Amino acid sequence: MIVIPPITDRKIRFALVGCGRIANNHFGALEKHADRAELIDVCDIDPAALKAAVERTGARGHASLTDMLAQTDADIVILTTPSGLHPTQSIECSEAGFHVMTEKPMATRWEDGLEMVKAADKAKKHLFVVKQNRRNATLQLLKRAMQEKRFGRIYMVNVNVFWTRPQEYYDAAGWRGTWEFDGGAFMNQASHYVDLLDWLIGPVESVQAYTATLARNIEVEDTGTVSVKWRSGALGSMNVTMLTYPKNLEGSITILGEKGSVRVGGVAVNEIQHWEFSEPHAMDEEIKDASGFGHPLYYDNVIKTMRGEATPETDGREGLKSLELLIAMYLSARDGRRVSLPLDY
Amino acid sequence: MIVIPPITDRKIRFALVGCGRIANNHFGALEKHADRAELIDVCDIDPAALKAAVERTGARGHASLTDMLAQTDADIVILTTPSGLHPTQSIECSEAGFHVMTEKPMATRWEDGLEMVKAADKAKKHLFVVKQNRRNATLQLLKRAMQEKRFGRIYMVNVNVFWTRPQEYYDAAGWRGTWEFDGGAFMNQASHYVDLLDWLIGPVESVQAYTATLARNIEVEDTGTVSVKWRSGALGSMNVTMLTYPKNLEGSITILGEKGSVRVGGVAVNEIQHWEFSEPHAMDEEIKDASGFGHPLYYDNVIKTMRGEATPETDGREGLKSLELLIAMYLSARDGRRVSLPLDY
Amino acid sequence: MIVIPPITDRKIRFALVGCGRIANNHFGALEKHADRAELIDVCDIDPAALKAAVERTGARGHASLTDMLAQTDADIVILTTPSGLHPTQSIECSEAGFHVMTEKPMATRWEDGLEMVKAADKAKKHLFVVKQNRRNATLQLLKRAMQEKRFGRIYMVNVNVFWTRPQEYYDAAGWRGTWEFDGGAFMNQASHYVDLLDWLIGPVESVQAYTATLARNIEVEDTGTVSVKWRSGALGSMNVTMLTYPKNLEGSITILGEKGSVRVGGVAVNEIQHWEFSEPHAMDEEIKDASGFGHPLYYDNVIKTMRGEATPETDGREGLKSLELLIAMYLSARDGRRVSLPLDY
Amino acid sequence: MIVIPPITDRKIRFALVGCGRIANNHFGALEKHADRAELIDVCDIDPAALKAAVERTGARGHASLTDMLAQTDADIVILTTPSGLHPTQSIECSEAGFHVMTEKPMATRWEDGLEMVKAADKAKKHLFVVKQNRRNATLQLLKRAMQEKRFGRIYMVNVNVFWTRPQEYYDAAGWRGTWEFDGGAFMNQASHYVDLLDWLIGPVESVQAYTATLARNIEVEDTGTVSVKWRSGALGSMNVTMLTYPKNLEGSITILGEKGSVRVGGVAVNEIQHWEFSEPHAMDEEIKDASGFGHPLYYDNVIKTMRGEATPETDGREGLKSLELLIAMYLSARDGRRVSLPLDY
Numbered sequence A, B, C, D: 001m002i003v004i005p006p007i008t009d010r011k012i013r014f015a016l017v018g019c020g021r022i023a024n025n026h027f028g029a030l031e032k033h034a035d036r037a038e039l040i041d042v043c044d045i046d047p048a049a050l051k052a053a054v055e056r057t058g059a060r061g062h063a064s065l066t067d068m069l070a071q072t073d074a075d076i077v078i079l080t081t082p083s084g085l086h087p088t089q090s091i092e093c094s095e096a097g098f099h100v101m102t103e104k105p106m107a108t109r110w111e112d113g114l115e116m117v118k119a120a121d122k123a124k125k126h127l128f129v130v131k132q133n134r135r136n137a138t139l140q141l142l143k144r145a146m147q148e149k150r151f152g153r154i155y156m157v158n159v160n161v162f163w164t165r166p167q168e169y170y171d172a173a174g175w176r177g178t179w180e181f182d183g184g185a186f187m188n189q190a191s192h193y194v195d196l197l198d199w200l201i202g203p204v205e206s207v208q209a210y211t212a213t214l215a216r217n218i219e220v221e222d223t224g225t226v227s228v229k230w231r232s233g234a235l236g237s238m239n240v241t242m243l244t245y246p247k248n249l250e251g252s253i254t255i256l257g258e259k260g261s262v263r264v265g266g267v268a269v270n271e272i273q274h275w276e277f278s279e280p281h282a283m284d285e286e287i288k289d290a291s292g293f294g295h296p297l298y299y300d301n302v303i304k305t306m307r308g309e310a311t312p313e314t315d316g317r318e319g320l321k322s323l324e325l326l327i328a329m330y331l332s333a334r335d336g337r338r339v340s341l342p343l344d345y
């Protein structure tokens, strides 16, 4: 990271590639931030999807990324393509001189994640990874409790993601449900919960995982469980399935330590259900209210970074922390063995 | 198992060894069943504990098991001694011609469990193992739902035992907190929940476990997590700690299958919290009411068995199913490897 | 094996324990051989099954094996009980001074098989294991071709047992479908085909196996496949399932060597389907006709042995050859690893 | 994959490198499709083989691939060279701006297969892999039955390739019978049957393999067997030998599921021998008739793709599915261990 000069007297310019489902949320976010930011170029290999985006946003349209990169003077290129394409696209963006914002997960394979970080490092350009859930109110209070050491020593952690994805979800596009482009219940659907393991609880020492495809016609897991050991000695598990009858049931985390016990549950870690500490704290009166956000807030940090006003909340190197866990869980489930971190020396 | 003749025209006679804490619950149970059963002999190596039992129950007292066995004409000898003594005591009882009822867990080491079953087999006498929680109302409804196949294919299971045991609990006696005589959070405190894994969900294929002593001054685990794979493909985890702040928090099970989702929680699997099936069933109207029992009910089955009126709900061979899981979890945690079942060919 | 004196001037005396399904075939066999042999004592722990046997055969009845052994002057005690009981019963017979004929498989666990052989050795009494299929006409021609070296070097072997067993088969009795008493598709249903691996092809070096319970509600496998390597370098596989739609389809073996190719198929290795050798042989004209037997013939060898006229076709030591393969296949499937022979040094 | 523009108003142009045995079948195929396609350039490092091709086809001749690539304006470059050369040649073609059609197998080493896909991806050009057997009538009906779910849950699969290749087959050229350029019984001779494992039955979880050179003077296997486990739980084996006495005997597949049992056999999966489903289907009346094709049909799809009329039936990414199985079988046979998929995270 060299010092990069702030961008001062114009809006920040965005280009976007992959005009599908979540691109809608990025369009909305950018619309909100229209005084500080504009979307000037969009790219999709499917003419209709590209048509809809160009008509909605007013941006110029392009049929390939390589062409858009030859033309755009965007500051940042946003990757909202299938997950397994993020690495090659990010590296091409970096090598052409652009900051990159990649949707999660940043890669589907470990060396691809590493290579996208190395390319951004060498270009002296930012790589932002979208982890928009971290700023949720419940997850912020948890993070604050952790930063203050309210739990003392952590002993036990349980994360559950009991959700529902029918066959028609995976059949919506060829990329979905594939190792190369998607990953399964852990790498795609529950990835914002995998993220909590290192971000809230701290460095992981090792994992032991089982995964399976118990019902869907896909090659990735629809169901999995992982035993986790933290370098602090804390132990825990994360359990996920997309096969829950008959709709989404639970997105929860329970954290138990020496001097505190918390559970945040609901369908999406959205309800503080248990909140008990050995000593009270100012933050405790926000607890009913804790129970925009998402992409719009994420974009405020990216904009501030470009203006010299802040630093990335989640850069490529931060993204590697949860990717390395996902890849250790996948190796452990594949080979039936404990896999320890870090993956590389 | 040869046919044994029913006992018809007298009360069933019990002797008991180990006049400590849970012996209180056996005394109460036997007092309840006083028309069908009597306690005629009690044994403890500690004079005071033995004194209290003899004065409460009226039974004759003995200072060693070997002496009591030379004297008593009990039908059944009840073992309420430290866990690691059950095997040698059971085998001595069997070899002297008595049916044995052992408190859980039946043994602390795998070959010791096997040997107590082999000795009872060779004597053609019963070995009952006390699993008094199975007849709890919540756990009975769950079992019934399982027997009816209400879930269809099971996908995902989570068991949590988040309880509290302070140092003074373990320091109460030398045997407690030791591998040889006790075992830890899984083998002692949460053993009635380990029991659910095979009894409710079915045959286990393998486990992967971590355990640790994170706070107590004992050699066994105070905290653990186990990843479980069932032969049906179902996956799950069980998470336990005795370090919960500041008192018992949760004893729960969640079961997710193709056509059903259930959670029974509370501090002791005592509250049906989620109960959703694809088709209704008669058993569904008992659900508020589900939310004596324990030892007294256990004793009714043991009495009925002795009278020819039933068969054991939980004999030594049934007890080996959860013991084999505990021993696989302990081997897996010790060696950091997946351990698959059955343990012996 | 000491020299045992022939039995000359009376019929050979049999006792039988376990008056169930295959005991019918032993009764028939003994009825056939009524001039050389008689059944004088029968034993079953179920009063009705014992009643039926006593009324059919005229033998005296007993309610326990231990009693029958105290009374009978049988030469041989026949074990037609659940498989997992054969070892303890055989050892008791041997230790009481009787020759034993055990139904297959001889044991369900390796050390139990070893112990029954050791006990018969120490008693200087025979242990016969029932492998009645070996004398089938098709299997005899195959064996003869092997003994003559008609194939030259063996290269490739495939055995398929594609059969059908519905849930009601396993539910018929508690012992069925259990590791301890039965074993699964390999150890029970297809055991006469496992037998061919060492008996026809020769010493096995190692196996690699997968097994699963894909549909039945039992703890043993309903489906399996094993990769086999012979010490000669020959390779092969055996594939079994009890889940075949909608009835028994195939019991076959294919053997390929340097100078010969054979397939014997049908539902039960009963049809010579392919029979091609580099040089013709006298045995080749029996080939249409090859395409009593069973228990009656087995009994002729047992009778002849007792009369000094022959030696056992299949004694306990011969039975250990296929048991050791089954146990290596079970260990390999359980642990996901190649298992090499012999099991013990 | 960018959108590539269709080729409309001329024939598609082909160039071919490696004017040996199977190039004959490509010449024939191209002759058939002479109104839509022409072969304009041929390449061989052996002057005579090149002479014969140029005189047969009328194409211009070249002595090196690098020269032909500098000259030809072919749309597609066809690789009919030794297998181990396909990757370097494909990558050179891609980097020079050509679509590539490679003969099977696409590579002999895993990273080489990956690299040829990566190079075609980066060039935005097609990589077709020749799997001409998939459109065989028998294999199409099987595929259709699979797509319709006629079997319900699959339980058991057996593939046998019992064929004959004498020493003179391998001695025909230096490349044959070598790991680097050929592979053995699985990667070369039976590769169209390995292909069925993922294409018909679905994603594979793991394999366990033995291979050997039992008779031929080559370094690759002439004989092998593989135990296979599918992610669905289905199990099976594939058995291959090139040592069959005295000529090709069997190319078969047997598939057993919940509600269907099929066997397609003959010398080359060319005879529907067993075809039994729980419910009839329109496709069932084609069954006698099922019992051009090959390269000519393959070429119709390649031509249609170039004309915008279809997409590849088998592109490089599709080719990686069977290559990854072959490489897992080779690693498993080499190291004597179960090898699980996918190979890369």
Ligand SMILES: NC(=O)C1=CN([C@@H]2O[C@H](COP(=O)(O)OP(=O)(O)OC[C@H]3O[C@@H](n4cnc5c(N)ncnc54)[C@H](O)[C@@H]3O)[C@@H](O)[C@H]2O)C=CC1
Binding pocket: A017, A018, A019, A020, A021, A022, A023, A043, A044, A045, A046, A049, A064, A065, A079, A080, A081, A082, A083, A084, A085, A103, A104, A105, A130, A132, A173, A188, D001
């Ligand atoms: N942050 C979050 O919470 C979420 C993130 N995502 C991530 O967003 C990405 C997109 O997911 P969706 O929008 O759901 O998928 P989608 O299938 O709806 O979007 C696919 C878009 O990319 C286009 N495309 C494919 N290849 C391309 C190429 N080479 N060049 C240009 N465009 C190409 C497709 O034509 C399509 O319009 C994935 O990485 C996913 O993990 C998705 C949902 C939630």
Ligand SMILES: NC(=O)C1=CN([C@@H]2O[C@H](COP(=O)(O)OP(=O)(O)OC[C@H]3O[C@@H](n4cnc5c(N)ncnc54)[C@H](O)[C@@H]3O)[C@@H](O)[C@H]2O)C=CC1
Binding pocket: B017, B018, B019, B020, B021, B022, B023, B043, B044, B045, B046, B049, B064, B065, B079, B080, B081, B082, B083, B084, B085, B103, B104, B105, B130, B132, B173, B188
């Ligand atoms: N079913 C359930 O839910 C429960 C079962 N238990 C089981 O009951 C057993 C007893 O636990 P506690 O009553 O809590 O322990 P305790 O320490 O209160 O009881 C110990 C008794 O055994 C006596 N003793 C020790 N060695 C002896 C010997 N060689 N001969 C005769 N007496 C001897 C001690 O003097 C003492 O009175 C353990 O196996 C435990 O796992 C305990 C609590 C709950």
Ligand SMILES: NC(=O)C1=CN([C@@H]2O[C@H](COP(=O)(O)OP(=O)(O)OC[C@H]3O[C@@H](n4cnc5c(N)ncnc54)[C@H](O)[C@@H]3O)[C@@H](O)[C@H]2O)C=CC1
Binding pocket: B001, C017, C018, C019, C020, C021, C022, C023, C043, C044, C045, C046, C049, C064, C065, C079, C080, C081, C082, C083, C084, C085, C103, C104, C105, C130, C132, C173, C188
């Ligand atoms: N050679 C072959 O081809 C076959 C061999 N078998 C073998 O025969 C044995 C019996 O199988 P089935 O006759 O099918 O089973 P079964 O369940 O029909 O026979 C069970 C008999 O043993 C009795 N029994 C159980 N425990 C006993 C005890 N402790 N003492 C005395 N009797 C006892 C039961 O009451 C019952 O009558 C098994 O080992 C089986 O593997 C069975 C079928 C085929």
Ligand SMILES: NC(=O)C1=CN([C@@H]2O[C@H](COP(=O)(O)OP(=O)(O)OC[C@H]3O[C@@H](n4cnc5c(N)ncnc54)[C@H](O)[C@@H]3O)[C@@H](O)[C@H]2O)C=CC1
Binding pocket: D017, D018, D019, D020, D021, D022, D023, D043, D044, D045, D046, D049, D064, D065, D079, D080, D081, D082, D083, D084, D085, D103, D104, D105, D130, D132, D173, D188
């Ligand atoms: N799809 C199918 O069913 C079949 C596919 N094949 C595949 O086709 C390929 C060729 O096999 P064959 O035609 O049987 O072999 P071959 O040995 O008959 O053909 C070899 C040709 O390539 C030439 N050659 C070697 N190195 C070269 C180079 N650097 N540049 C140019 N030419 C070179 C040789 O001189 C020779 O004419 C192999 O990959 C094989 O696996 C072969 C038979 C069947």
Ligand SMILES: CC(=O)N[C@H]1[C@@H](OP(=O)(O)OP(=O)(O)OC[C@H]2O[C@@H](n3ccc(=O)[nH]c3=O)[C@H](O)[C@@H]2O)O[C@H](C(=O)O)[C@@H](O)[C@@H]1O
Binding pocket: A133, A163, A164, A165, A166, A169, A188, A189, A190, A191, A192, A246, A247, A248
């Ligand atoms: C914040 C967060 O955790 N986000 C994750 C989350 O996103 P998002 O909230 O947008 O999903 P959304 O709830 O709309 O359901 C999506 C489909 O589910 C099906 N769906 C959903 C719920 C249900 O009960 N049943 C059901 O069929 C139905 O088909 C829906 O169309 O799911 C994304 C995904 O899976 O691709 C993950 O990638 C994200 O990490």
Ligand SMILES: CC(=O)N[C@H]1[C@@H](OP(=O)(O)OP(=O)(O)OC[C@H]2O[C@@H](n3ccc(=O)[nH]c3=O)[C@H](O)[C@@H]2O)O[C@H](C(=O)O)[C@@H](O)[C@@H]1O
Binding pocket: B133, B163, B164, B165, B166, B169, B188, B189, B190, B191, B192, B246, B247, B248
């Ligand atoms: C049915 C069931 O699951 N039984 C298990 C259960 O039994 P039982 O219910 O009798 O325990 P009980 O709740 O009385 O607390 C015991 C001590 O805990 C301490 N204790 C308890 C709760 C708490 O909040 N804090 C605390 O210190 C306090 O010191 C208590 O004296 O705990 C047993 C044990 O541990 O030996 C297990 O062996 C049993 O399997």
Ligand SMILES: CC(=O)N[C@H]1[C@@H](OP(=O)(O)OP(=O)(O)OC[C@H]2O[C@@H](n3ccc(=O)[nH]c3=O)[C@H](O)[C@@H]2O)O[C@H](C(=O)O)[C@@H](O)[C@@H]1O
Binding pocket: C133, C163, C164, C165, C166, C169, C188, C189, C190, C191, C192, C246, C247, C248
């Ligand atoms: C010689 C040989 O290989 N013997 C083996 C064989 O014996 P035996 O031939 O006597 O079986 P038998 O064919 O009568 O079917 C038995 C039941 O199958 C069910 N059965 C059978 C066939 C079928 O199509 N469908 C079916 O339901 C039906 O319920 C039948 O009642 O099966 C025995 C068994 O399994 O215990 C194995 O232990 C033996 O090794």
Ligand SMILES: CC(=O)N[C@H]1[C@@H](OP(=O)(O)OP(=O)(O)OC[C@H]2O[C@@H](n3ccc(=O)[nH]c3=O)[C@H](O)[C@@H]2O)O[C@H](C(=O)O)[C@@H](O)[C@@H]1O
Binding pocket: D133, D163, D164, D165, D166, D169, D188, D189, D190, D191, D192, D246, D247, D248
């Ligand atoms: C469709 C299919 O499965 N194709 C595979 C198949 O191709 P193709 O059908 O063209 O073989 P072909 O039957 O002509 O015999 C070839 C030689 O075998 C010898 N051969 C053959 C049969 C026999 O009985 N004896 C014999 O010596 C004789 O020397 C023959 O010259 O064999 C190819 C090969 O091996 O290189 C595999 O690469 C292909 O995957």
Ligand SMILES: [Cl-]
Binding pocket: A249, A250, A251, A252, A265, A266, A267
């Ligand atoms: Cl919740």
Ligand SMILES: [Cl-]
Binding pocket: B249, B250, B251, B252, B265, B266, B267
């Ligand atoms: Cl709760």
Ligand SMILES: [Cl-]
Binding pocket: C249, C250, C251, C252, C265, C266, C267
């Ligand atoms: Cl057949």
Ligand SMILES: [Cl-]
Binding pocket: D249, D250, D251, D252, D265, D266, D267
């Ligand atoms: Cl055939």
Ligand code: NA
Binding pocket: A210, A211, A212, A221, A333, A334
């Ligand atoms: Na898995």
Ligand code: NA
Binding pocket: B210, B211, B212, B221, B333, B334
């Ligand atoms: Na531990």
Ligand code: NA
Binding pocket: C210, C211, C212, C221, C333, C334
């Ligand atoms: Na298995």
Ligand code: NA
Binding pocket: D210, D211, D212, D221, D333, D334
């Ligand atoms: Na090999």
